[PDB]
Amino acid sequence: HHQKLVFFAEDVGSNKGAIIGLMVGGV
Amino acid sequence: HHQKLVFFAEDVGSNKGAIIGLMVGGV
Amino acid sequence: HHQKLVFFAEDVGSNKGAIIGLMVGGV
Amino acid sequence: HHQKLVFFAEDVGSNKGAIIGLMVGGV
Amino acid sequence: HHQKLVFFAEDVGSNKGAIIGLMVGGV
Amino acid sequence: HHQKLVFFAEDVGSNKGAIIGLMVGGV
Amino acid sequence: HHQKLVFFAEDVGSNKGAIIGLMVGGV
Amino acid sequence: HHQKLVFFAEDVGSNKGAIIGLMVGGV
Amino acid sequence: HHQKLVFFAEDVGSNKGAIIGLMVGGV
Amino acid sequence: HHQKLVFFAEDVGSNKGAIIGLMVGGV
Amino acid sequence: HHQKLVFFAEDVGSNKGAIIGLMVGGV
Amino acid sequence: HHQKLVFFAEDVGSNKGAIIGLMVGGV
Amino acid sequence: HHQKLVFFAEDVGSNKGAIIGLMVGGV
Amino acid sequence: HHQKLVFFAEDVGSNKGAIIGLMVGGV
Amino acid sequence: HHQKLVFFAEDVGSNKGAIIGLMVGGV
Amino acid sequence: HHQKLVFFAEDVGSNKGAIIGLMVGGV
Amino acid sequence: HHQKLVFFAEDVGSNKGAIIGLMVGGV
Amino acid sequence: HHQKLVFFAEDVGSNKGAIIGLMVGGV
Amino acid sequence: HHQKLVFFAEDVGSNKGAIIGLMVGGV
Amino acid sequence: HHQKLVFFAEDVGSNKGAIIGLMVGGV
Amino acid sequence: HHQKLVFFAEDVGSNKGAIIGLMVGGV
């Protein structure tokens, strides 16, 4: 037999800030 | 027999802020 | 026999903020 | 025998904010 | 025997805000 | 034997806000 | 034997706001 | 034997707001 | 043997607002 | 003194395809 | 002194296809 | 004195494809 | 003195593909 | 004196592919 | 005196692919 | 005296691929 | 006297691949 | 028999700050 | 007098691959 | 007097690979 | 008089591999 159990609680993996992939800027 | 169980609670994987993929700026 | 069980809760994967795919700006 | 069970609760995968695919700005 | 069960509860996958596909602005 | 069961509750997939496909603005 | 069952409850997939396909503005 | 069952409840797929296909404006 | 069942309740696919196909204007 | 001038050329704001406001279907 | 000038050329706002407000099917 | 000038050329803001406001389906 | 000039050339802001506001699918 | 000039050329801000605002799928 | 000039060329800010605002999938 | 000048050439800020704002998947 | 000049050439800030804002997977 | 068990607590793997993948800047 | 000049050449700030803001996976 | 000059050449600040902001995995 | 000149040739500041901000993993 094979078993795998996963539990993510209240506020897992959430974004409350800023995620920027790529930023290019002149002056 | 094979089993896999996953539980995502309340507020898992949510976005409350900013997600920007790509940003280009002149000035 | 094969089983896979998943649960998602109240506010999973929800966007309450801003999602921008691509942004280009001059001045 | 094969089984797969998924449960999405109250407010999963909803948008309550802003989703922008693409944005271009001159100034 | 093959089974797949899905349940979406009260307010899944709904839009309460803004969805913009594409935006172009001169100024 | 094959089965697939899906349930969508009250306000699933509904729009209460604004959906804009494409937007072009001069000023 | 093959079965598929779908249930949409009270207010699925409804529009209570604005859906605009395409918008062009000079000013 | 093949079976398909669909149920749409009260205000499913209804419009209670505005649907605009295309919009062009000078000023 | 092949079967299909579809049920529409009270106000499925009803318009209780405004639908505009195409709109053009100057000032 | 206040002036506003707008010019629309040949096939501006025209439909040469399909515009559907709302669509519902069981199967 | 106040002025507004608007010009429509050949086929502004014309429909050369299909415009459907609302469509409910079934099977 | 105040002036605003806008020019839309041959084929601005036209639809040559498909615009669907809302779409609900089953099985 | 105040001036604002905008020019849209041949095929600006047009749709030649598909624009869907909202899509719900049972299967 | 104040001036702002904008020029959009041949095929600005056009859609030739697919724009989907919202998508909900059971299977 | 104040001046701002912007120029957009042939295929600026156009979509030729797929833009999806929100996607929810059961399986 | 104040001057700003911006130039976008052939194919700036365009999408030729896939932009997905949000994605939730059960399996 | 104040001046700011910006030039974006052929294919600046364009997406030719995949942009995903947020992704949640059960399995 | 093979078993693996994972429990992630209230606030595992969440972001409350700025994530920037790549950054380029002039002067 | 004050001057600022910026030049972005052919393929600056583009995406030709994958940009993922956030990713949550059960298995 | 003050002067600032920036030149980005062919393929500055582009993404040709994978940018992941945040990744969470249960197994 | 104050002067600053910056030049970035080639694919300066580009990503061709994998950028991951944060990575959390079970077994």
From Swiss-Prot, chains A, B, C, D, E, F, G, H, I, J, K, L, M, N, O, P, Q, R, S, T, U:
Changing residue 12 to C: Causes formation of an artifactual disulfide bond with PSEN1. The record marks 23 as: Susceptible to oxidation. The record marks 4-5, 7-8 as: Cleavage. Zn(2+) 2 binds at residues 1-2. Changing residue 9 to G: In AD1; Flemish mutation; increases the solubility of processed amyloid-beta peptides and increases the stability of peptide oligomers. Cu(2+) 2 binds at residues 1-2. Changing residue 1 to R: Only 23% zinc-induced amyloid-beta protein 28 aggregation. The record marks 21 as: Implicated in free radical propagation. It comes from the Eukaryota. This is P3(40).
